[PDB]
């Protein structure tokens, strides 16, 4: 063991409910894949990082299938919430 461990970056709704922004990631060469059917936003780690903190964005909803966030063509307001910045 020693493989993986990296947690998934999350967007949140106004009150703090988290949703992942990617359905897979690479952790030091180990791929980690979210369970099929998991709710996600199809914006990616990059997308979350580009969001201005504490501002509302219309985030595209999806559902994980084999490591990919498959968009539902629906949207929900989501936020990037830093500890500090």
Author numbering: 7 to 91
What is the paper's account of this structure, in its own sentences?
We have determined the crystal structure of both non-glycosylated (accession code: 3 fpr) and glycosylated Evasin-1 (accession code: 3 fpt), to 1.7 Å and 2.70 Å respectively. In order to obtain non-glycosylated protein, Evasin-1 was expressed in the presence of tunicamycin, a known inhibitor of N-linked glycosylation. The crystal structure of the non-glycosylated Evasin-1 contains two molecules per asymmetric unit, monomer A (Asp5-Asp91) and monomer B (Gly10-Trp89). In both monomers, the extreme N-terminal and C-terminal regions, comprising the six-histidine tag, are flexible and were not seen in the electron density maps. The overall structure of the Evasin-1 molecule is boat shaped, with approximate dimensions of 35 Å × 20 Å × 13 Å. The four disulfide bridges consist of: Cys12-Cys33 connecting the N-terminal region of strand β1with β3; Cys29-Cys70 connecting the beginning of β3 with β6; Cys46-Cys75 connecting the strands β5 with β7 in the beta sheet β5-β6-β7 and finally Cys65-Cys84 connecting the other two strands β6 with β7 in the same beta sheet. The disulfide bridges are positioned along the interior of the protein, forming a central core, and undoubtedly conferring structural rigidity by stabilization of the protein core. The N-terminal region is anchored not only by the disulfide bridge, but also by an intricate hydrogen bond network that places the N-terminal segment in an exposed and favourable position for chemokine binding. The C-terminal loop points to the solvent, presenting the aromatic residue Trp89 totally exposed and located in a flexible region with a Cα B-factor = 50.0 Å2, much higher than the average B-factor  = 34.8 Å2 for the whole protein chain of monomer A (B-factor for the Cα of monomer A  = 32.8 Å2, calculated with BAVERAGE from CCP4, 1994).
